[PDB]
Amino acid sequence: AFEENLYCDYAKAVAGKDVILAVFNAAGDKLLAVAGQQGLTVNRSKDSIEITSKDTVGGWKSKIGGMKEWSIENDGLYVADAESHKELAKYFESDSPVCVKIINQASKKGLFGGLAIVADYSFEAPFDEAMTYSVKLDGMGALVDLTITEGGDQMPG
Amino acid sequence: AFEENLYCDYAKAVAGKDVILAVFNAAGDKLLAVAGQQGLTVNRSKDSIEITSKDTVGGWKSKIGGMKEWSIENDGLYVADAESHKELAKYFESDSPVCVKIINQASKKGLFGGLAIVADYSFEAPFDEAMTYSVKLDGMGALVDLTITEGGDQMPG
Amino acid sequence: AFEENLYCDYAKAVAGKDVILAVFNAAGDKLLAVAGQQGLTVNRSKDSIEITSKDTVGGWKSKIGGMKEWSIENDGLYVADAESHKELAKYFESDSPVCVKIINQASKKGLFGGLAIVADYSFEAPFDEAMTYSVKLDGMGALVDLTITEGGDQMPG
Amino acid sequence: AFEENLYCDYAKAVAGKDVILAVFNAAGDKLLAVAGQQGLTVNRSKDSIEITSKDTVGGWKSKIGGMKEWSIENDGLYVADAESHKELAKYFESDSPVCVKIINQASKKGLFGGLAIVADYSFEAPFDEAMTYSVKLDGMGALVDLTITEGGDQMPG
Amino acid sequence: AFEENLYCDYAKAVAGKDVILAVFNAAGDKLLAVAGQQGLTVNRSKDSIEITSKDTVGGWKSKIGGMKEWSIENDGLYVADAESHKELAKYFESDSPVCVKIINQASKKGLFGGLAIVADYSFEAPFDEAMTYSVKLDGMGALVDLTITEGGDQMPG
């Protein structure tokens, strides 16, 4: 086939559109892709503790790792009666943590999951564009790396 | 040859694509080029201590060098099941230092190597682009300059 | 017949005049060939995402396909009281999408169909020629390829 | 013969009509000349990286070659039920790369082959001419030069 | 491994989070890490007795060491129904000494242990922060240095 793959050979990159943020509803029985989403940022950082002393030799500072924190930023087209946005609205109103999940919907693998505060939930309505939302999810604890953890492959539905 | 090199003479610049970040796996037996990498920054800085006093003559401040620190910033296309990204994920999860190496893969010389904290490991997924990663490696001690040190020329493999 | 087809043998090309643009009226019960049409352009394009990295080997850029878009350009002799032009006028005035169809009226097969914005609807009246119209139909979503889809063979009438 | 070739001697130019674009079907078992094709353009370009510095002597800019990219443009008479055009339609619809080949059908040598995105697939139907198609094939990787590579001489069939 | 440890060599500092205060329950059968603790101070001081006389030669005061005293200060997030805080509350109420222990929970070594008065047990509740506690443990006698004493490595549990 294809002339024995002489000039065409049939994992190299993931399209961003296949990676979506999904939230669980308040009961946990439905996993909801956030409607109209367009941009996704997963932030994970670790603190560095400087432990340089006069015992330190060589002229370089001495550092050790500290504690980790994470946040998720998601923006997109805002539709107020969408079920995921009503869930996010209730989470923001009731001061309740939301279980969030990052999934590759094309490969059907979960990437990250954890409990987040809805730290920011804002909207923009320019007269010449579409109304957009912006949500910030502040991690409350561990962000589980599902790429190196067994399971976590439930798709939104 | 070539008309005695009258108008063509056959070290002047290194293409950035030949300089890659590689990490060792947790055991140290495999050196792994970070998959999908596109940008590389090696930061090395030194503090300055001002020692100006009333003995200082001439109207210029007096300074001496302080301690050194380094970090490495690397971004590129994120593929979650790539072996190097699974290693980086385990390093970030387990709070374990990673041995990193900067190599010129074309000339097969190592440039820099050292122990780093995975200080930041973040991801972006725009709907119209490819999913990218961004990693920050905070140096824990010396960054060995392999350009002026013997050896350090193991290539990723 | 014909001397056993020794020198004459009785699919090779389609005359452009048999391929016409037709629009549905606002209710959808009548399919209307746009009156006086003379030129037809169906544009379909796909974006390319460059995914070249330092893993890319061989010296060639790496690309993947992106999202698709389409438009239809149609020009011809303008007659203002023609029913199809009154429909196009109401679509342009009311900001309502128009269901358009490209058909081969000679072979009675539909070629393409989809929902379009009337993005441009303009007119020229030179003193020495006939008054012409020009319409641009910007696709809102999928342009269904009826050449490889079952059905879609309703003729204007 | 011919008076010892005194005034007539029996590689100097290739007629464009002998150079055709062919695509493989989705399975790869049939190589299909694109039906009705009339024009063919094979674009291959390389980037130039300027590396001029203050070390540069002589007053000329210093440049090195960058990465390569290619595309193929093909136009011709459009017949919608032709097998090659149905294949191109399915490639455009399914977002799947197409294995393309440039061959000299008279000398039966392949010229170029590679994986392409169907980046553009458009049609024109003037009332006084024949309906034409225009296709743009955006290269995804290497375009193999079969003029300097062994093999690649399968003809469409 | 790691290129023979050319640039990375795999005791230099203890993270404060691994050093915790633990108290025994009233019976002595359970050792309880104080819940929510964030800061720890172990104070050990010795008195100096000046013995300068007119026999003292050289112009320097003459001093000898006196008696030792110790205290422990611990603050953190206050949760009233935590078992360790209920134990501390009963110790403060009943005027009974509490057996306290400083342990490195990461290395599982005890550092210090002794009998203390609960000298201060106070709370702060700012409207914009979390409720905190502050406890002061006044030593009643010897503070045993478990870093130079055999044993004393029972972990809280």
DSSP one-letter string for C79-146: -TTSHHHHHHHHHHHHT--EEEEEEETTTTEEEEEEEEEEEEEEEE--TTS--EEEEEEEE-S--EET
Asked whether at least 3 C-beta pairs link E and C within 8 Å, the reply is no
Instruction: Please choose, from the candidates A93, A102, A78, A96, the residue with its C-alpha nearest in 3D space to the C-alpha of residue A20.
Output: A102
End-to-end CA distance of chain D: 39
- Contact indicator for E139, E71 with CB cutoff of 8 Å: yes
Distance from CA of E9 to the nearest CA of B (A): 8
Query: Going by C-beta distance under 8 Å and a sequence separation of 6 or more, which residues neighbour residue A68?
Result: A44, A45, A46, A47, A143, B92
Resolution (A): 2.3
Asked whether at least 3 C-beta pairs link C and B within 8 Å, the reply is yes
Residue A34 CA to residue A134 CA, distance in Å, equals 11
Distance of CA B34 to the CA centre of its chain: 11
Instruction: Please choose, from the candidates E157, E42, E62, the residue with its C-alpha nearest in 3D space to the C-alpha of residue E111.
Output: E42
Residue E139 CA to residue E45 CA, distance in Å, equals 11
DSSP codes joined into one string, A118-138: EEEEEEE--TTS--EEEEEEE
Query: B8 in contact with D at a CB cutoff of 8 Å?
Result: no
One-letter amino acid of B31: L
Q: Which method was used?
A: cryo-EM
Query: E8 in contact with B at a CB cutoff of 8 Å?
Result: yes
Residue D117 CA to residue D92 CA, distance in Å, equals 8
Interface touch B128/C53, C-beta < 8 Å: no
Query: E13 in contact with A at a CB cutoff of 8 Å?
Result: yes
Interface touch A7/D31, C-beta < 8 Å: no
Query: C41 in contact with A at a CB cutoff of 8 Å?
Result: no
Could you identify the residue written with the tokens 């690649």?
A: D152
Q: Is B151 left (phi over 0), alpha (psi -120 to 50) or beta?
A: left
Interface touch D49/B15, C-beta < 8 Å: yes
Query: D135 in contact with C at a CB cutoff of 8 Å?
Result: no
Interface touch C53/B20, C-beta < 8 Å: no
Query: A1 in contact with B at a CB cutoff of 8 Å?
Result: no
Please report the number of interchain residue pairs, chain B to chain D, with beta-carbon separation below 8 angstroms: 9
Interface touch D144/A6, C-beta < 8 Å: yes
- Domain edges within chain B: 11-145
Token readout for D35 is: 């039906």
Query: Going by C-beta distance under 8 Å and a sequence separation of 6 or more, which residues neighbour residue A93?
Result: none
Q: Which CATH number fits domain B11-145: 2.30.110, 3.90.1720, 3.40.50, 2.60.40?
A: 2.30.110
Give the nearest partner residue to B130 out of C49, C56, C67, using CB atoms: C49
> What does residue B85 show for φ and ψ, rounded to 5 degrees?
-75, -30
Q: Which CATH fold would you assign to the domain D13-145?
A: Pnp Oxidase; Chain A (2.30.110)
- Contact indicator for B17, B36 with CB cutoff of 8 Å: no
Distance from CA of D113 to the nearest CA of B (A): 26
Classify C11-45+61-145 by CATH class.
few secondary structures
Residue E67 CA to residue C38 CA, distance in Å, equals 110
Cβ contacts of A15 on chain C, cutoff 8 Å: 49, 64
Residue E100 CA to residue E147 CA, distance in Å, equals 15
Cβ contacts of B12 on chain D, cutoff 8 Å: 51, 55, 62
Helices (H), E32-116: 83-94
SS3 content of chain B, % helix, strand, coil (to 5): 10, 45, 40
Q: By three-state DSSP, how is residue D55 classified?
A: coil
- Contact indicator for C119, C58 with CB cutoff of 8 Å: no
Interface touch E15/A62, C-beta < 8 Å: no
One-letter amino acid of A8: C
CA-nearest residue to C62 within chain B is B36
Query: B12 in contact with D at a CB cutoff of 8 Å?
Result: yes
Residue C139 CA to residue C145 CA, distance in Å, equals 13
Query: E11 in contact with B at a CB cutoff of 8 Å?
Result: no
Asked whether at least 3 C-beta pairs link D and E within 8 Å, the reply is no
- For residue B5, the surrounding DSSP H or E stretch is helix B2-5
Q: Which CATH fold would you assign to the domain E11-45+59-145?
A: Factor Xa Inhibitor (4.10.410)
E strands, chain D, are: 19-24, 31-33, 37-50, 63-77, 98-104, 109-124, 132-139, 144-145
Q: By three-state DSSP, how is residue A16 classified?
A: helix
Distance from CA of A75 to the nearest CA of B (A): 10
Strands D19-24 and C98-104: unpaired
Instruction: Please choose, from the candidates A93, A91, A112, A114, the residue with its C-alpha nearest in 3D space to the C-alpha of residue A103.
Output: A112
- In the complex, which subunits touch A with 3 or more CB pairs below 8 angstroms? B, C, D, E
Interface touch B101/E7, C-beta < 8 Å: yes
Residue B87 DSSP code: H
